[PDB]
Design a protein around this ligand. Sequence first.
Ligand SMILES: [Cl-]
Ligand SMILES: [Cl-]
Ligand code: NA
Lengths: 67, 67
Amino acid sequence: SEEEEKRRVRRERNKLAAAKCRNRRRELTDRLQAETDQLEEEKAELESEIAELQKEKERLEFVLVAH
Amino acid sequence: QERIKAERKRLRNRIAASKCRKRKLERISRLEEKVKTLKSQNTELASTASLLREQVAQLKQKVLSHV
DNA sequence: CGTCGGTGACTCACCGACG
DNA sequence: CGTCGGTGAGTCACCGAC
Ligand SMILES: [Cl-]
Ligand SMILES: [Cl-]
Ligand code: NA
C-alpha cells in the first residue's frame, strides 16, 4: 500500500523522537546528579577549610593576649 | 470474561507506568532544587573563608609587631 | 495552512524478584 | 513454576512552531 508507507515512516520518525525525549531526560538526570555530587564535595572542602581557619584564628588571638 | 483479567492487568500497568514516570520527574526536581541551594551555600561559605583568611593574616602580623 | 518534531500517556516486551 | 511490579520502548493523540 501507499498510505501504509506514509504511516510506517511516520511511526519510524516518531519512534526516534520518543527515544530522543527519553535519552535527553536520562542525560539531564545524569548531568544533575554529577553536578550535585561535585557541589557536595566543594561544600565539604569549604566547611573543612573554614573549620581550620577558625581554629588558627583563635590560637593566634590567644597567642596575642599573652603579651 | 477473560477480557476482564486483561483489563485489570492494563490498569495495574497503567498505575505502574504512572508511578514510574512520576518518580523520574520528582528526582529531577529534587536535584535541580539541590543544585540551586548548594550553589548559594557555597558562595556564602567561600566568602566566609576569604574573610577568615585575611583575619588570620592580620593576626600573624600582629603577633610579630610584639616580637 | 500543512507537515514537522516534541511530549504525555497507554500499552507491550522483557526482566528479576519471589511465594 | 508462574505471576508480580518496574522500566525500556513503540504507539497514539494532540499541539505549537514555523
Ligand atoms: Cl507493571
Ligand atoms: Cl511527522
Ligand atoms: Na496519570
